[PDB]
Design a protein. Structure first.
Ligand code: 7YY
Ligand code: 7YY
Lengths: 301, 298
């Protein structure tokens, strides 16, 4: 009972965060086995960050230019290399708290937990979604660069996001752990805009099922619609179209509530055309789109 | 603003499973003591009207199964303190953090580590409501999950989850086993009082709005604390205490807006409604003055 924005327990990840400093530039890094991963932006001085030539900046540095701090313990850098936008620092000590982990690239619409860190110290955890325009609406202050996003799958930590930068609208941009940006961004200190965002329709529907499970039912009606007729209206309002794969993924929540997906779509279509009219759903006055169907199942089953 | 929880790692290493018979729930292992709800000593026929003193007399140390994962911790002593059982085990937990037990007041926020079978499953932030419930998220098997705050290096444990009420909200104790609210640990339907809006947290949210440049609602007038408190009651808002005025001081200083001037602004919103938004069309009441500062400054 109840419904909350829930993150995964962060303990497996907390043991892997460190501070990386190069000159006076400092940020957070991720220590797994005997490698520290961090944004390559750390090798920039203040002059370099506007238009960095990273290959050049990197050849001009040596192992002892890198100061890696794990709490009070100092790790010794014995090698380094660039992979896209992520620096890989080989250190002489393996992390004994290394979890079972893999690196994954997630898709727009999917959610993950963010461990926000400052000077190598974990400070907060929260859940967010990859937006369709490849940004995330995070909560980050100066010094958060290199914080990571992750999901837990039984015993295995899937790392999917490494935080790089804030955009002028206050949303955030980053890479996967292979160093490739989500979206059309580049790791330099220039003002960059994102593409236009859309609402994640399959997530809205999952959240409407959670509301029904928790007793909020005022928006239901006895009508149904077809997939195509629903998608025409959704497109009009800048909602993502629904595919048959989405209909399948909502199956378990449709079975648990007895409300068919296309029946829910008919409710959502009415909401798009007429609004909430001052009513709320699960305490929200806006349609929430950052819970996946799987998120809802974890919390309501 | 996100609802952001504290990192849970220091607490995850203290979670265990406690079983008595087939009744199972979560416990908290600190040093050589396991804390858990005393409801664990009930069979199904006892849960509706348990005589805890009678049930405990018939229990021996060797009736308690305490497991950290698959590893059994042998119980060498037991006592009951209000609604929590304290189980002395033969192993001091080597992951015990620096910790203290605190009793929080309504309006205060904390992180909840939701656990099932002694295994951590999710973390989230919530506030204690003025009617001493929490609007949590808990399924069956979550009894004994704990709520906490982190102050620097030290974990402050403030909440042990016990039960779900008929309206779907949740009730529990502090770590000395004293319930928050007028509830009792039996399987009967119990009603919580009517909830009110947490005024001190609404004021913190209005200060955060001002800090970020959103300040249309600031009005030219001031009020007294007594006038404000009597108005708030009429709208199902909590009256302010002297402690509330004090914890708002830093935000007042940062913005140069006196607390009572902000109260006069809220009073207007209460009597006239809003038309535009703030930051949202709804006034948020689960961010404390500490939460605001922690997310705006660090
Ligand atoms: C407000 N906010 C929200 N998220 C962020 C993340 N972030 C950050 O933490 N730091 C950045 N630049 C740095 C400045 C430094 C000054 N010192 C002494 N050391 C510093 C290290 C960093 Cl990383 N930036 C900006 C930024 C970081 C990048 F990785 C990048 F490729 C381009 C950028 F413009 C930043 O966004 N701040
Ligand atoms: C849906 N929901 C949300 N929160 C809760 C919390 N909660 C819980 O997890 N378990 C409870 N009763 C038990 C039944 C058991 C069956 N077995 C085999 N073992 C069991 C152990 C427990 Cl604790 N309850 C009910 C409950 C628990 C109490 F501690 C109490 F004092 C009164 C109560 F009615 C419960 O609310 N479920």
């Amino acid at each position: 009972s109840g419904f909350r924005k829930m993150a995964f327990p962060s303990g497996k990840v907390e043991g892997c965060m460190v501070q990386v400093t190069c000159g006076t530039t400092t940020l957070n890094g991720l220590w797994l086995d005997d490698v520290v991963y961090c944004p390559r932006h750390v090798i920039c001085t203040s002059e370099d960050m506007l238009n960095p030539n990273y290959e050049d900046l990197l050849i001009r540095k040596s192992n002892h230019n890198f100061l890696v701090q794990a709490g009070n313990v100092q790790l010794r850098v014995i090698g380094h290399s660039m992979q896209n936008c992520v620096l890989k620092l080989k250190v002489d000590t393996a992390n004994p708290k290394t979890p079972k982990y893999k690196f994954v690239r997630i898709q727009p619409g999917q959610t993950f937990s963010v461990l926000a860190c400052y000077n190598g110290s974990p400070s907060g955890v929260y859940q967010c979604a990859m937006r369709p325009n490849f940004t995330i609406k995070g909560s980050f202050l100066n010094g958060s660069c290199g914080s990571v996003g992750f999901n837990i799958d039984y015993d295995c930590v899937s790392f999917c996001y490494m935080h790089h930068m804030v955009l002028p609208t206050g949303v955030h941009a980053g890479t996967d752990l292979e160093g490739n940006f989500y979206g059309p961004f580049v790791d330099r200190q220039t003002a960059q805009a994102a593409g236009t965002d859309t609402t994640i329709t399959v997530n809205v529907l999952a959240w409407l099922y959670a509301a029904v499970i928790n007793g909020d039912r005022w928006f239901l009606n006895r009508f149904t619609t077809t997939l195509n007729d629903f998608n025409l209206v959704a497109m009009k309002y800048n909602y993502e179209p629904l595919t048959q794969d989405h209909v399948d993924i909502l199956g378990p929540l449709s079975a648990q509530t007895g409300i068919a997906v296309l029946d829910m779509c008919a409710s959502l279509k009415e909401l798009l055309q007429n609004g909430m009219n001052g009513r709320t759903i699960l305490g929200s006055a806006l349609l929430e789109d950052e819970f996946t169907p799987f998120d809802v199942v974890r919390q309501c089953s």
